[PDB]
Amino acid sequence: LYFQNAMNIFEMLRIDEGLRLKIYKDTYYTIGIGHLLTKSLNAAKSELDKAIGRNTNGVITKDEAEKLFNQDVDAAVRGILRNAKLKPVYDSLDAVRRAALINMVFQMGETGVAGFTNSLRMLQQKRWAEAAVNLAKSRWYNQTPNRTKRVITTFATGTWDAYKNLRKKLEQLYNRYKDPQDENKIGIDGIQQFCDDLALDPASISVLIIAWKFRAATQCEFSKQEFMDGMTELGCDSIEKLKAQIPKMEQELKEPGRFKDFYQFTFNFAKNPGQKGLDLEMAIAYWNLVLNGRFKFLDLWNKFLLEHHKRSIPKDTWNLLLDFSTMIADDMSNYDEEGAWPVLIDDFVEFARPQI
Numbered sequence: 001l002y003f004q005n006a007m008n009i010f011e012m013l014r015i016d017e018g019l020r021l022k023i024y025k026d027t028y029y030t031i032g033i034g035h036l037l038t039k040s041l042n043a044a045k046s047e048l049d050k051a052i053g054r055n056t057n058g059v060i061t062k063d064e065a066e067k068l069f070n071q072d073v074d075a076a077v078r079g080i081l082r083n084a085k086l087k088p089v090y091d092s093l094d095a096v097r098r099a100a101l102i103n104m105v106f107q108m109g110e111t112g113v114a115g116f117t118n119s120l121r122m123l124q125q126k127r128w129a130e131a132a133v134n135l136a137k138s139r140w141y142n143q144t145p146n147r148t149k150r151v152i153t154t155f156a157t158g159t160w161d162a163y164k165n166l167r168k169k170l171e172q173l174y175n176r177y178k179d180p181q182d183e184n185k186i187g188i189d190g191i192q193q194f195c196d197d198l199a200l201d202p203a204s205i206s207v208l209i210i211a212w213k214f215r216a217a218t219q220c221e222f223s224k225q226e227f228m229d230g231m232t233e234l235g236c237d238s239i240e241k242l243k244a245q246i247p248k249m250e251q252e253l254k255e256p257g258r259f260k261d262f263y264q265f266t267f268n269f270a271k272n273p274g275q276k277g278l279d280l281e282m283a284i285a286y287w288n289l290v291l292n293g294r295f296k297f298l299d300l301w302n303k304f305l306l307e308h309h310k311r312s313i314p315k316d317t318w319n320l321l322l323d324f325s326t327m328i329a330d331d332m333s334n335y336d337e338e339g340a341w342p343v344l345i346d347d348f349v350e351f352a353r354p355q356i
């Protein structure tokens with residue numbers, strides 16, 4: 001297999017599809033760059049363990065993800081070559097343009113790509129300009145505008161310039177924020193600078209919404225990989241582009257499913273690494289940001305905790321408070337004292353009820 005390319009192709013799809021180092025769902029058990037494991041998590045982890053050759057517990061290194069990716073590329077190429085509608089075009093193409101074709105197969109499958117009869121013919125004919133214009137007129141171009149533009153540029157030029165130039169733009173932007181003491185991260189000063197450039201306070205709800213969209217691990221920490229992967233997945237190559245994405249993020253949060261996801265993410269982001277629970281003062285500070293205008297009893301809840309709890313908040317309790325806020329009547333008359341709520345919430349209702 002060492003004789004068969006594959007270096008630029010891994011980085012090309014890492015940018016376009018994304019690299020996940022933990023087992024996820026594609027809406028099917030997946031890992032790496034879209035690597036399907038099975039059609040049970042026990043069975044999914046078993047397949048991953050057998051493929052890697054160690055007890056991974058569903059977590060892998062980038063090198064392991066690369067090994068899996070190379071197998072998927074090899075399978076993709078075998079499939080393209082068996083396809084009578086794809087083989088002629090693939091055969092005629094140079095190495096860089098073959099990588100752009102494999103990119104399409106990875107996104108929409110063989111049948112999806114075979115549907116582009118007119119564009120594929122133009123490619124076979126080496127009519128780059130005509131093909132590039134024709135591909136930009138499809139739903140593919142509208143569904144994934146950033147990825148599609150990059151793939152079309154690969155077909156138009158036969159170079160890696162769309163990927164090379166995005167990485168340049170992102171590395172130059174990163175340099176403005178990186179820690180002088182540690183090049184591989186954005187420190188305290190950098191995070192403040194990033195928020196200043198966005199014209200936002202770092203403790204604001206807008207910045208918390210941004211952290212959620214970036215899947216950031218921890219408050220006051222921001223790694224280079226979080227910055228790079230975040231900006232690419234969001235289709236942003238500048239602060240101005242990210243700024244213009246904020247209204248869309250706000251709208252998403254009006255849907256309860258997305259709000260629940262953001263609410264639960266807040267707990268994980270706010271907590272200290274090495275600790276399983278969230279310190280009370282910190283939990284109250286983030287609750288004031290995320291439950292502002294959603295919970296009638298928020299202030300009385302804060303007073304109750306500061307006076308009667310005075311300890312850490314577990315994840316389950318954090319998660320259940322959103323359900324409590326949604327269902328609770330203004331007079332608390334519908335509260336079920338024997339209806340599975342955490343003891344802390346039972347204690348709060350008992351404390352709050354005399355105060356109305």
Ligand SMILES: *CC(C)C(=O)NC[C@@H](NC(=O)[C@H](Cc1nc2ccc(C(C)C)cc2s1)NC(=O)CC)C1CCCCC1
Pocket residue numbers: 191194195202203204205207208210211212214216218219220221222285286289
């Ligand atoms: C760490 C520190 C000195 C501190 O004051 N912590 C408590 C307050 N937290 C914040 O101010 C954080 C700062 C940020 N962290 C990150 C991490 C990644 C990003 C990228 C761009 C996605 C951005 C930021 S800003 N801010 C937040 O958590 C957003 C609300 C704490 C904030 C809440 C009120 C009490 C003080």
